[PDB]
Symmetry: C3
Subunit: 166 residues, 3 copies
Amino acid sequence: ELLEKVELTEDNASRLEEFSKEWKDASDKWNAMAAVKAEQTKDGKHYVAGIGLSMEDTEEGKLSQFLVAANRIAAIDPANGNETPMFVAQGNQIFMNDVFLKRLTAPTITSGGNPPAFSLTPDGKLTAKNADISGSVNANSGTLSNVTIAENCTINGTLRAEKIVG
Amino acid sequence: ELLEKVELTEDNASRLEEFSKEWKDASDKWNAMAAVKAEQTKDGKHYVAGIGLSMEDTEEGKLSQFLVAANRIAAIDPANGNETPMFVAQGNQIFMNDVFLKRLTAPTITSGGNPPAFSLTPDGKLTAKNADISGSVNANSGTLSNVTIAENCTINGTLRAEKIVG
Amino acid sequence: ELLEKVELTEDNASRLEEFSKEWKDASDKWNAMAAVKAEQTKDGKHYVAGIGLSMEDTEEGKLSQFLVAANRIAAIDPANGNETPMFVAQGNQIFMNDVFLKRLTAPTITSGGNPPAFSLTPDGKLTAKNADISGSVNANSGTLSNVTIAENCTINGTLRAEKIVG
């Protein structure tokens, strides 16, 4: 029964080279994705470029963090199994919901529809159903219907009506 | 020494068997990871969805692009012990900083105020405390207290004043 | 000669020592990433922490899904062949393109040009150039240069017209 162990020794030696080849392939593949994703470099010297998912602990406690320095994004929302992209590089396009603001700069503003009612052209035009002023008004031209007056009415230029009664 | 080399044979063989078992289990687990999570190999550039960073040379030089054809995200600020999510996937959640704009289409616009003030409502309404105009006007109603008729005026409808100077 | 096969067993033993070294090293690394980034363990129901691209089966077929607990992204557009620092997400700023709107809140609004030709301020003023109103107007203090008065006008206050024609 000597014949057994040596055949075994072979059943071993023969399997080791092939396993070595497989593990070498795996190690090379890890060398690939490591420079891709898992650089396994523990430092803040290169901003941890690539990708990182640090479950970092402070004196506060465990706090999650995900670090990527490459934007290169093109997203789609999955809600209801939907397939709508949202970040074409032309500065977002889904819709603007309720937004708080303190600085805006826009030439064109539209009320809505084949025709907007109250609009704000870059030319400075404005259509409205009201103009309430609690202060100064400097008007230049005008085609006006009713001007109800009961307070100071002093004139420096010209006035020419059709009927003047009083 | 009698059995030492012989026993090493079976010890090896058994250790290889178990080592191969754990390797097969783990390798199947990896086979499961890139199958769904990102991809691997040298997959062509047709759809290549999943997590992947590639450093391709350009005219300027390297380009480490990071591709994500994927879905809803939510992120928080980890700043030195901060825990407040800000833009967590609710369709432009909180607010915009200094922003330039081009065009819009909106029913309702306000100011934003505690004991508060002016707004641009869907129905043209505006209480603008200083409505300076340097061009044409088409008014169909108005109540003017202190009239400063500066240049040549005219009336098509009628004027009727209790007072008169001239 | 024969001593090669006997030597073969102990050579295999040393080779297994080396392979066990490397393999348990790698497995320990992956186990470290498991709660960090690998997420080898299952999630169950809704609990989820970390990363993973799950292409779940649905009655309609494929449903890829991605989930991030918390992150902070950099700013490089697809912009192949160009470096584009866009969407830094600093100070909650992205830059907005053409878009609709439903609800707005902005005390400060500009004309979308080098100066603000028409401006909205927390003071509530408006230096426009045309404001036509088909409804109510309440202008307290104002001047009128080239105006035609197309409907009724009544004064209960003082009247100091420059001239009267009729």
